[PDB]
Structures are given as C-alpha cells and as structure tokens.
From Swiss-Prot, chain A:
It comes from the Eukaryota. The lineage of its organism: Eukaryota, Metazoa, Chordata, Craniata, Vertebrata. Keywords: Acetylation, ATP synthesis, ATP-binding, CF(1), Glycoprotein, Hydrogen ion transport, Ion transport, Magnesium, Membrane, Metal-binding, Mitochondrion, Mitochondrion inner membrane, Nucleotide-binding, Phosphoprotein, Transit peptide, Translocase, Transport. One of its GO terms (molecular function) is ATP hydrolysis activity. Homotrimer. Component of the ATP synthase complex composed at least of ATP5F1A/subunit alpha, ATP5F1B/subunit beta, ATP5MC1/subunit c (homooctomer), MT-ATP6/subunit a, MT-ATP8/subunit 8, ATP5ME/subunit e, ATP5MF/subunit f, ATP5MG/subunit g, ATP5MK/subunit k, ATP5MJ/subunit j, ATP5F1C/subunit gamma, ATP5F1D/subunit delta, ATP5F1E/subunit epsilon, ATP5PF/subunit F6, ATP5PB/subunit b, ATP5PD/subunit d, ATP5PO/subunit OSCP. This is ATP synthase F(1) complex catalytic subunit beta, mitochondrial. Phosphate binds at G151, V152, G153, K154, T155. The modification Phosphothreonine is found at T254. The modification N6-succinyllysine is found at K66, K103, K201, K206, K456. It holds the Pfam family ATP-synt_ab. Mg(2+) 2 binds at E180.
From Swiss-Prot, chain B:
Mg(2+) binds at T154, D247. This is ATP synthase F(1) complex subunit alpha, mitochondrial. The lineage of its organism: Eukaryota, Metazoa, Chordata, Craniata, Vertebrata. The modification Phosphoserine is found at S11, S41, S101, S119. Homotrimer. Component of the ATP synthase complex composed at least of ATP5F1A/subunit alpha, ATP5F1B/subunit beta, ATP5MC1/subunit c (homooctomer), MT-ATP6/subunit a, MT-ATP8/subunit 8, ATP5ME/subunit e, ATP5MF/subunit f, ATP5MG/subunit g, ATP5MK/subunit k, ATP5MJ/subunit j, ATP5F1C/subunit gamma, ATP5F1D/subunit delta, ATP5F1E/subunit epsilon, ATP5PF/subunit F6, ATP5PB/subunit b, ATP5PD/subunit d, ATP5PO/subunit OSCP. Belongs to the ATPase alpha/beta chains family. It comes from Bos taurus. It is found in: Mitochondrion inner membrane; Cell membrane. Keywords: Acetylation, ATP synthesis, ATP-binding, Cell membrane, CF(1), Glycoprotein, Hydrogen ion transport, Ion transport, Magnesium, Membrane, Metal-binding, Methylation, Mitochondrion, Mitochondrion inner membrane, Nucleotide-binding, Phosphoprotein, Pyrrolidone carboxylic acid, Transit peptide, Transport. GO terms for biological process: proton motive force-driven ATP synthesis. The modification N6-succinyllysine is found at K96, K102, K165, K174, K196, K240, K362, K425, K433, K458, K466. The keyword NAD does not apply. PROSITE patterns: ATPASE_ALPHA_BETA.
Curated annotation (Swiss-Prot), chain C:
The chain holds residues 250 to 295 of 298 of the full protein. It comes from Bos taurus (Bovine). It is found in: Mitochondrion inner membrane. The gene is ATP5F1C. The modification N6-succinyllysine is found at K21. Component of the ATP synthase complex composed at least of ATP5F1A/subunit alpha, ATP5F1B/subunit beta, ATP5MC1/subunit c (homooctomer), MT-ATP6/subunit a, MT-ATP8/subunit 8, ATP5ME/subunit e, ATP5MF/subunit f, ATP5MG/subunit g, ATP5MK/subunit k, ATP5MJ/subunit j, ATP5F1C/subunit gamma, ATP5F1D/subunit delta, ATP5F1E/subunit epsilon, ATP5PF/subunit F6, ATP5PB/subunit b, ATP5PD/subunit d, ATP5PO/subunit OSCP. Belongs to the ATPase gamma chain family. Subunit gamma, of the mitochondrial membrane ATP synthase complex (F(1)F(0) ATP synthase or Complex V) that produces ATP from ADP in the presence of a proton gradient across the membrane which is generated by electron transport complexes of the respiratory chain. ATP synthase complex consist of a soluble F(1) head domain - the catalytic core - and a membrane F(1) domain - the membrane proton channel. These two domains are linked by a central stalk rotating inside the F(1) region and a stationary peripheral stalk. This is ATP synthase F(1) complex subunit gamma, mitochondrial.
Length: 458, 480, 46, 466
C-alpha cells in the first residue's frame, strides 16, 4: 500500500497510511526521487501515522510525497556473489561494478538463534598466527575485541586473518565498516585487491564488504552492522561455514544507536547513551554465535571513550567479548610483527579443558617466562641467564611473515598450523635451542625454518 | 467490539503499548496480543491502558486486538519444571515438549510477614571450603555474590547446585534442596554451556533454569527473577527447600532502567529510577525461612552483582548489600594471583549463617577465623613468625578447584589438619598436594570416622582423639 | 643504601596503588558530572 | 458517600466523587478487597477527582471500582494495649494475637508541638560507649541520629543502645521499623519475648512495635514512621511519661516519598528527589520531640545513599538532631568498631558549662591529635610514617592508640568480634583518654588498645604480649 509523508524533521520522517500500517522495522520506499531513499519504521504514533528513520538525506522531501510499504524489513543480496563487492546498508552496490546478482535476498533484522540451536562445543578457530593461536586463541562463534589505534598493522592483521581462515578452514569473511571514513574505505578496498583477498577478475574473493560511511544519517550507520551480519548468516546457515565477521568500529555502532534514540525523542540514560544501550547491543551480538549449522566469529575493533573502561559503551560491549587482541606501538617499534602484545591479549578458551593440556602448559610457560624476563630487566645467575636468553628467543619466534605482506616485502609469508606453533615454543622453553643463536628466530614461520636459518647462517 | 474484555492498540514504540478499551482489566493483569505476545496492564488511565510488552514490539501494530486473561501476571509452578529450561513466562525453550504444571503463582506476590517466619537454623551447604567454613549460609538466608567481571561469581552458584546431589539422591525431603537458576542478560551460549555442565554432573534433574538472555526484550529480563522466585516459593510453601540464583541483578536493574527511562520516569543516581532499591528489595524479601505452622519450608537466594573495578560503594551494589544478609566478595587481584575461589575473607560476611553451621564445622572454622584474622596484619620475631606460617598454609587450604564440591565432614577433616598444626613443618607450596593425598586416604581407609562426624554433626572427644592419630600417622607417611 | 632502596621500592608501590585509586575516583566523578548535567537538562525540558 | 477509581499507577490512585469530596489527608476505603486497602487523599485535581496514595498494593484494582470516604485521616489504636503488640501502617495487629482493644484512637497526622511547648533541658545520657560518651554525648529527651552507609553498623549500634539505655530507663519504648529487613523485626520481636520485655501472658510489656518494611509499597513506607510517632505521642502526652523512640530506618521515609513523587508527576528536584523533601521531613521530624508535657529520647538510624553524606536525604536530616553519630566505611574496613567518625560526630551538650572542663578538654584534645594525624594522610600514604619528624611521629603513634581505644566490643556483636561485650563508665572513659594524651602509655603497643573496655584492659593485654 501507498502512504503519504506528513512530517520531515531532519532524518526523521512521519508517514500516514490509509489502510493497514507497515509494522515496525519495515522498509519503506520514497517515491519520486533520483536515488533510492529507504525509511525504516520505528514507531506507530497512532492516527494511522508511523515514525521512520531515514537511510539517506531527506532534503527536497515534500509533505504528501508518496511512500511505498515494501512488506518487509530492509532486504539485501546474500550469496557467493557478495564476495569481493562493496554494498551499502540497504544492499546497493557502491563499487560501480553493477548489480550484485545473488539468487537470494535476506532481511537484515533477524532474530538471534534460539536456545535449542545453541552449540555447547567449545572450539578454537585456528588463525595460523603464532601470537594469537598460542596465547590468546579465537573461539568459533566468539567475539574478539581488537585494541590499538593506527600504525600498529591493524589492516594487515585483518587481511591475513581473511586469507588464513579461507586457506586453512575454507570459510569466508565479511567486513562491516560502521562509520567508515570514505578515504579509508577506499584505501582498504585497494589494499585488499593488492593482497589478493579481493579478486576483480574471477570469483575467488574471500571478503564481502559492507560500508556505512561517516557522512550517512544515524539510521544508516546504526543498521549497517546488521547488514554485514546478514551477509555472514548466509554462509553459516545456508552453506555450513565457519564465517569471520569484522566490525570496524563497535563504538560507532553504539554511537549511531545513541543518535537514532536521540532523534526519536527517547530520554537519554547515563552518560548520554540510549536507554536501549544493552538491548541494542544484545540483539546484534547474540546473532554472532556457534550453531548446529556452523559459526560466525567476530573481530571487533574497540574504541574506549575517554580511555575509561568503565564507560557504559565499552563496559556493555565487554560483556559479549571472549578474547582480546591488543596491538601495541611498543611491540611494533621493537620490530615484532604482528605487533600483538603477548601479555595483554587474553582469551577465555585458554583452558586446559577447552584447548589441550599441551596447549595450556606451553602458553602458561611462555607467559611466565616473558613476565620473568621483564622482572629481570630491572636488574644474573645461571638460572636467570637461561631464562633471559630463552625469553628473548620466544619474543622473536612470536613474530611472523604474513602472506598478505609478500609483494610489499618479498619475504615469503607463512601460515603456521596449531601443533607446529605449540611444539615450536615447547622446544625453546626446554632449552633445546639455547645451543643455537638468537636472531635466527626472528621473522620465520614453522620452527624447522628457524633451525634452517641457523643451519644456513652458522 | 467488546470494549470491556478486549481493546485495540492505539500506539506502540517505546516498549509500551497504549490500548483503547479493556474497561474491565485489572491493574497488573496479563493481557494477550493478536500476535501471541503477552503483556502486563501497568497504567490504568481514563482513556487508555498502558501495557508493558513481554517480547519484541515489532510484533504489535496500531489496531491490533488485545484480550484480557483475567489473571494478575502469573507463571506455572510445580515439580514438573524440574529438569527444564524455560523463558521468563515459563514456556519451555529446551525443545523437550509440554510442561505439565497445573498450578500458577503471581509473580508479584508480597513476601511473608514477621509471624510466618523463624530464624534460619539449617545449613545450606555449598561444598566450597572458604564459604562453608568462614561465610556459612543457612536455609532461608539471602547471600550476595559480588565482584568484577570474570572473578568466579557464577562458579560459586554452580558448585552449590552440583553439591546438592548428595542430599537429593536421598529420601528425606527435608534435607533436599531444589534449585532454580535465573539467567538475566547473559549470552544464550553461556546458558547452554551451563545446562550441559549441570546435566553432566546429574544436577539438572533437580534444577529449573529460567532464561531471559541478552537478546530478549528488557521487560522479559525484568520479569525473569520474579518468575523464578515464584517457582522457588512453590517449594518454600510446600514444606520443602529451594535455592535460587539471580545471575545477575545488575543486568536486571539495567533492563528496568531502560523500561523506566522509556516511560519517562525521573532518573537519579546513574540515571536509575527511585524505585530501583524496591525492585530488588521486594524480590529478595521472598527468600525466607518459614515456621513449622507454615510447613517449615525455605527459599534461599544467591543474588549476583557485578562491580566496576571493585567498587562496592556504588548505588546498585550498596542497594543490594542493604537488602541481603551478607556478601561473598570476589576480588580481581586475588583471581589474578591464582587464588581460587578468589574470596576476600576479611571483606566477606555472613550475618545469620553461624547459627546455620554444623557444630563440627563451627569448631575448626572458628579457630581458623581467629588464626586468619591474626594473619591479616602480619602479612623475623618468633611471636609473629608462627602467625605468618599458619596463615599461608590455611590460605592454601581455602584454594579449591571447580565442579567437585566437598562433603562437610571432608571439609572438617582438611581444615582440622591446618588448624591443629599438622601443616606447619610442611612448606606452603606443597599444602595443596598434601590435601588431595590426605583426602583420598581418609575416604578409602577411615569411613567410620567420616560417617560418624557426618551423622553426629560434631567432633566428640572420641572423634577428636581418633582423628589426631590418623593425621599424625599420615603426616609421617607422606614424604614428597 | 639498602634502607633507601627498600623505602623507595615501597613508596613507588604506594604511589602505584594511589594512582589506581585516584584514577578510579577521577572516572566515577567524570561519569557523574555528565549524568548530572544531563538530568538537569532533561528536567528543564520536561 | 462513594467514589469511583478513574486511574491507577503503582501507589497513586485517582478517584472521582459524585457527591461531597474528601478533604486532603482523609483515609478512603477501597471496596471489595480481601484485606483492608486504604487510600490517603493527597491532592484535589479538579473535576470532582482526588489523587490518592495507597497504603498497600494496587494490583487487582479496576477503573470504576467503588471507594468510600471514612470521614477522617488514618486512625490507629493508641494507649497501654499497644504495648507488647505489633501493628502495621494502618494500626492493624500483625502478630496474630487478635484485636488491639484500646479505649482511644488517634489520627497519624497531628501538628508538631508549638515553639511554646519546647523544653531547654540538657542532661547527659551516658551510654557506656566510649566514642559517644567522650566526644559527642547523648542527652536525655534529646534527638539522636546514627548516620551510615550500607553495612557499616547502624542497626548493631541501635541494638546496643536498646541494650544499654532501655534497661536503665524507667518508662515505655516504641520501635518503628521503617523500610528495613522483615527478618530483623522477627529477630527483635522474639528476642524481646525471650528476655521478657514483651510478655505474651501479662500486661507487663514495656515496648510497642510498629512495622512497615522493605517488602512494602512506597505509600506504606512513607507513612509508617508517622504511625510509630503517633504511638509515642500518646505516651508522651496522655501519660506524661519518659518515652524512648527507636526508628530503623528514617531515610526510608524520604526514599519512599521520592518513589511516590515520581508517580505524582511533580517536576523533580536535585538528584531526582521530590521537591517537597525538606518540608515533608520537617513536618514529620518536628513531631519527634520532647515537650514540656513529656520526654522523648529518640534514636533514628539514618541510611546514607552510596556513602554520600551530601545526598539531600542525610544532608537535610542533620539539622533535626541534637547529637549525631556518623559512621565511616573506611573506619569499619580498618577494623574499628563501632565505626564512628570521631571528627564528624557532634553534640549540643559538648560544652564545658555542661560536661565540665575536664570532659571538654580531653574530648577536644583527642580531636586535635586525630585531626593532626588526619591532615598528614597525604604524605603517609606515599612515603609512610618513617619520613615524618619526631614531633609528627609522636602525634601519629598516640593518635593511632586513641583510634584503637575508641573501639569497643559490643554485647550485641559478640559473634563478630569474638569478645565479651563491654560497657565503660564515663569517668573511666575520660581517665583512659586523658592518660593516653598525657603520654602515660607511649611505651605500650598499639594493638593493646584495640577492642577493650577500660584502660586497665589495655595494660593487661600489653603485659601478655611482652
């Protein structure tokens, strides 16, 4: 049915319908405008009028302008054809390559999996990255808080994750830019092309891109994480995959929700956040989980407002996180890449019960010896000298050449299997390689290459 | 058409539906929406009824028909719920089919007054040494579990549930403890993993799980504790004993604050409404010990509160402390050091539990209480050298793994060794190893003494002298 | 020299614990100021 | 005649009347309830409609439900047969012992004693509690307030005072439970039966009990203090006798008011409180008073939200008191019980012309040394005591001993301290702190002064140590 605009106040538009009203969350299509303008129903105001949030600018709108009820929430292209493409919150291509020709479309508002669909199986999603797999492993269906600003190799880590998960497991990735800076959205796209995770010439792309740029209205930036989620849900629920979902930034998801709540006249809660802060977060996060079909695992870049970890935004987000990856400038300036702080990064599945007994012991041994090395930095005996040289070789063996940084450097990038990582750090703790030099452990893959780097350079 | 028994939605979109009609609806009556959602008549006004919706409001539209149920908001109660996972309304979410419960209780029923009650006298055994010895809990008591995120809060509750298996396998209904775990605001995966754990431990059969998770509408999270409490009161008022865990009340308060701000009620501290204390007070007052004329039953509550950075002086933490009968405080710094359970002894309190401790435990734990209080200021001259030596070894006995809660007599045996001075010559780093080796010895060899302590609930002179010889002869036998 | 080493070790530890305590007070006050200002604005608007 | 309910939200019920409108404060009776449901008229809204506050739950009320005007405010039993009994907000027996057959009733709203009725009599009431007796003594017929955050020691202190004052007192007591733990009422009731201050077989009871606890809706919690007061007012005026009034906890009165105010739609005041916080408190507190006609020694426990003494509730309460005992969480955490802040607890009778120069001098001397210790906390927290001058080290050592000698085992807290309770004569309190200030025990270890009664116990304790 066709309604009529009765109010326009910024990105808030009221629409009157003569017959049956569109349910809350339904997408409405504004008639007679150059590009596509979607309005999402937020409230039934009474007297046949609904209040909506606009997905694009509202300038030029006239009272009485015709509006079409689509019959459903925002529906976007889902399938293999999303891989390598960039779409917006309403599923339109924004890479100037034409339609995204999927054989299915899906609603962006979808209930989180039910209790009966839950998997109790705790499984490590092997990334093939030594720092991560050993000390702060990712859990299938889990959420990982990615910390650190820029210049700490964030994007290269992201691209290698996409590369590795597709290579090792056979699962695809989805990148949701929530409040994406248009300049940085362009950079990321072309960097992904260079690394090979996006291929413009064939169907081998490993990521689907979903962008909600900063200059878009609150409604668009609030819903774009859901759009990305919906693309990921196809690969899990229709193709049985272990999918990766990147959300850059989770705070900007919260911020956009606060702005939408403000625009709808809802009274702000503590610190100015929306009263629906926790439910806004929960209805989104709970869709990221392990089910019987597969799993969506999510890496979420975290901004901490005012560096206050007790701020409602990070505090509410932390409730949903299972692990952290802390990218550090101090680790970067030491030349160790990835620049992951091996002591600050933690994981809930670092447990002798979930991961192997062999996994837990070695990782606890690596943690202890790195902390003890920092203790001995202030100040040695034969036992202390042995723990110092062991730890310095451990610091270097945590570094890794990436497959994504192969054309830039020329150095062969490495994907290291889990058991190869565990036994590598196990052979250093035992002092089996304290017979061999130190810098042979810097920027290598499996331990067999560190032995060969000592065999060649002797 | 029937404006007395039915109404039409006027507006919806702030968690509240305004409904025209329903002229005969009661305050706090459950109503039913066309979509199948339920709601509570909150606001009776001259021209409309304000309805709180127990589900997603996307499912309600202007013009939808709303029907009276004639019933003040209630839930199914009874033994049929044991072994089941239900939502806040008491509907099965575990796919195990219908729940047979015929009786129902109002979720908002006021707690028993002064006269129906009697002082808590019966032990509610957690099987956790630190708790049962130093922070004892009685049946009828409310004992807050409080601490920062990931400090071991839920683990206290889970081990307590698992512990009851030994009584519940018996035939004496008075000694049994039926359990209710209320999940509020949690991840669905977390709850699923929880039931799996309980099932593996054969504890699920005497447990009801009520779940309103992170993606459930705020009014469902608000409701969940009250629903679970009514399921608990069924046992309390049937002359039996129930234990309820609210995990957690911080998230419930957040859910209520959402509802309250959307209702445009004036906020105060941290934007919480002025009735946020009452939200928790009316709930926890319902955990009670009944006198014999009322059947002698009880409901024990373990509410959970999450602190930010160890700050117990904040609004919601202080509110709940001012309600419960003491707290178990879990500390990040202790958890970080590997002290598990991460219980701060000095800061933890049981206001009413000492009368609900067996004499057997009252004996060895009172002297441990003294020896730890004399250790919390000395932590070298010989006068303070003994106080430090004893305190570190006693602290080692307070360490405990998960999922293996201990019989009270087994707890009394391990604490006996440290208090009487059978660990003094042994090094602190080897106490944990000694304890497990000593426990398997007394279980395998001396069941007669452990059985007698369990039955009598006391260590007599015969039991004391007999136990003296066993620990002496094992200490000489224990080498490395 | 031993006593100075000792006392300064303890002082640096006491300073550390005070930094944490003060940072927590700072941030509670920081949040409370924002919340209070907002409640005054909301009350005036209502 | 009859009214009809037109609106219900929580404790607030609007009622329309066709003939004759009840004045403000009148008790209305809701028809058809299983237990008596009273609505108190708060406002006239216009159009023959009144806004009321319910004294019990409003669940089950329907628009159109009949309401009758009783023609009076809430009236309760007053007199000798309230003694030994427990009543609720509306004066109903809640002890299962049948009717309270008093000869008289009284409205729970009465006007405060006028200025002409005031007594200026100021006589010390010795408690045997060292901190109180020394620094901020209570007065007979005076208004005493016990301030404290959650769990710091308000109720233990009020219970110790009932133990130390009431037995030495010759008259009646009234205990009002206001928004506190129902199980604390059960404890008190049965302990009074055990001790015999309540006798179920005879007319010899010396205590009247009134309860409206934290299980009650806010209308009941807001009015129950008035119910307690009314019972005490009778004993003060119609018997001209010395009355003790204990209230736990008076904050709950103001909090309940905040809850109803939110439902009445008032524009809120600071921190979300009712705009009427101070006047509401004044109209209630001004009735809690001694008059020329009779004495009320009142002791009110005062909860402190989030430990914030500047919160409008506790902040407004101070000026209603003659003596204040302010408890501190920091002090409790150091192990000092009772957790009294010796530099924030005051009394009108702390005056050399009242307590004598010796008492006054020792008190002020103790406070000076404690304040001198306090304003060194900044430097001590960083560098420790070893950096201070010899002069300052002396003041720190004595202040720490004084801090400890201010602690005391309570008869009521024996389970928690592990020590037998102690009551110290005033002269012994003065002498003990006098000797410490003089440096007579500079040689003794600090821990010797912890949890003792008289100074001789600190000497004996030190002798056992070395």
């Amino acid at each position: 049915t066709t309604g009529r605009i009765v109010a326009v106040i910024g990105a808030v538009v009221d629409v009157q319908f003569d017959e049956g009203l569109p349910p809350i969350l339904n997408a409405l299509e504004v008639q007679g405008r150059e590009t596509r303008l979607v309005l999402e129903v937020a409230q039934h105001l009474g007297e046949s009028t609904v209040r909506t949030i606009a997905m694009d600018g509202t300038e030029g709108l006239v009272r009485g302008q015709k509006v079409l009820d689509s019959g459903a929430p925002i529906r976007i292209p889902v399938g293999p054809e999303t891989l390598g493409r960039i779409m917006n919150v309403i599923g339109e291509p924004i890479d100037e390559r034409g339609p995204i020709k999927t054989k299915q479309f899906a609603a962006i508002h979808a209930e989180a999996p039910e209790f009966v669909e839950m998997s109790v199986e705790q499984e490590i999603l092997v990334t093939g990255i030594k720092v991560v797999d050993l000390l702060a492993p990712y859990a299938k269906g889990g959420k990982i808080g990615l910390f650190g600003g820029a210049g700490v190799g964030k994007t290269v880590l992201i691209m290698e994750l996409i590369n590795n998960v597709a290579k090792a497991h056979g699962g695809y990735s989805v990148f949701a830019g929530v409040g994406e800076r248009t300049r940085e959205g362009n950079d990321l796209y072309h960097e992904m092309i260079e690394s090979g995770v996006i291929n413009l010439k064939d169907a081998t792309s490993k990521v689907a891109l979903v962008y909600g740029q900063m200059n878009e209205p609150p409604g668009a930036r609030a819903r774009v994480a859901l759009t990305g989620l919906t693309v990921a849900e196809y690969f899990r629920d229709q193709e049985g995959q272990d999918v990766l979902l990147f959300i850059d930034n989770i705070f900007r998801f919260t911020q956009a929700g606060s702005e939408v709540s403000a625009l709808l006249g809802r009274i702000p809660s503590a610190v100015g956040y929306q009263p629906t802060l926790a439910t806004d977060m929960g209805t989104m996060q709970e869709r990221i989980t392990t089910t019987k079909k597969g799993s969506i695992t999510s890496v979420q870049a975290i901004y901490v407002p005012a560096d206050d970890l007790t701020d409602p935004a990070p505090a509410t987000t932390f409730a949903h996180l299972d692990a952290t990856t802390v990218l550090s400038r101090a680790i970067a300036e030491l030349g160790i890449y990835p620049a992951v702080d091996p002591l600050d990064s933690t994981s809930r599945i670092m447990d002798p019960n979930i991961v192997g007994s062999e996994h837990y012991d070695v990782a606890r041994g690596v943690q202890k010896i790195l902390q003890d090395y920092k203790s001995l930095q202030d100040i040695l005996s034969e036992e202390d000298k042995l723990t110092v040289s062991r730890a310095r070789k451990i610091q270097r063996f945590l570094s890794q050449p990436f497959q994504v940084a192969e054309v830039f450097t020329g150095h062969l990038g490495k994907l290291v299997p889990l058991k190869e990582t565990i036994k590598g750090f196990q052979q250093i703790l035992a002092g089996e390689y304290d017979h061999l030099p130190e810098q042979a452990f810097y920027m290598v893959g499996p331990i067999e290459e560190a032995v060969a780097k000592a065999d060649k350079l002797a | 058409v029937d404006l007395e028994e039915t109404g039409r939605v006027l507006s919806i979109g702030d968690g509240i539906a305004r409904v025209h009609g329903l002229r005969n609806v009661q305050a706090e009556e459950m109503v039913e929406f066309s979509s199948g959602l339920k709601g509570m008549s909150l606001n009776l006004e001259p021209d409309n009824v304000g309805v709180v919706v127990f589900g997603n409001d996307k499912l309600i539209k202007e013009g939808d028909i709303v029907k009276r149920t004639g019933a003040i908001v209630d839930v199914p109660v009874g033994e049929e719920l044991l072994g089941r996972v239900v939502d806040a309304l008491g509907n099965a979410i575990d796919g195990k089919g219908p729940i047979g419960s015929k009786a129902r209780r109002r979720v908002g029923l006021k707690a028993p007054g002064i006269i129906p009650r009697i002082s808590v006298r019966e032990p509610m055994q957690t099987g956790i040494k630190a708790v049962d010895s130093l922070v004892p809990i009685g049946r009828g008591q409310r004992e807050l579990i409080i601490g920062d995120r990931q400090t071991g809060k839920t683990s206290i509750a889970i081990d307590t549930i698992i512990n009851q298996k030994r009584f519940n396998d018996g035939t004496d209904e008075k000694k049994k403890l039926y359990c209710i775990y209320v999940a509020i605001g949690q991840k669905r995966s977390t709850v699923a993993q929880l039931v799996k754990r309980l099932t593996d431990a054969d504890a699920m059969k005497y447990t009801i799980v009520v779940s309103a998770t992170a993606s459930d509408a705020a009014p469902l999270q608000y409701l969940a504790p009250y629903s679970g409490c009514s399921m608990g009161e069924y046992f309390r008022d049937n002359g039996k004993h129930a234990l309820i865990i609210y995990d957690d009340l911080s998230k419930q308060a957040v859910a209520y604050r959402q509802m309250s701000l959307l209702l445009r009620r004036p906020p105060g501290r941290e934007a919480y409404p002025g009735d946020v204390f009452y939200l928790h007070s009316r709930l926890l007052e319902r955990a009670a010990k009944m006198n014999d004329a009322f059947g002698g039953g009880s409901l024990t509550a373990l509410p959970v509160i999450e602190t930010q950075a160890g700050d117990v002086s904040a609004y919601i933490p202080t509110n709940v402390i001012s309600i419960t009968d003491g707290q178990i405080f879990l500390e990040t710094e202790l958890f970080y050091k590997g002290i598990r359970p991460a219980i701060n002894v000095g800061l933890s309190v049981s206001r009413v539990g000492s009368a609900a401790q067996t004499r057997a435990m009252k004996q060895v734990a009172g002297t441990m209480k003294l020896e730890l209080a004399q250790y919390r200021e000395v932590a070298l001259d010989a006068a303070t050298q003994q106080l430090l030596s004893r305190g570190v070894r006693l602290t080692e006995l307070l360490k405990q793994g998960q999922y293996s809660p201990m019989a009270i007599e087994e707890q009394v045996a391990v604490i006996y060794a440290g208090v009487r001075g059978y660990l003094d010559k042994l090094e602190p780093s080897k106490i944990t190893k000694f304890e497990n080796a000593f426990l398997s010895h007394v279980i395998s060899q001396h069941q007669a003494l452990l059985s007698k302590i369990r039955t009598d609930g006391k260590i007599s002179e015969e039991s004391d002298a007999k136990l003296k010889e066993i620990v002496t002869n094992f200490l000489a036998g224990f080498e490395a | 020299q031993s006593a100075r080493m000792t006392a300064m070790d303890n002082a640096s530890k006491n300073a550390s614990e005070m930094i944490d305590k003060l940072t927590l007070t700072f941030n509670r006050t920081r949040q409370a100021v924002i919340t209070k200002e907002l409640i005054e604005i909301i009350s005036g608007a209502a």
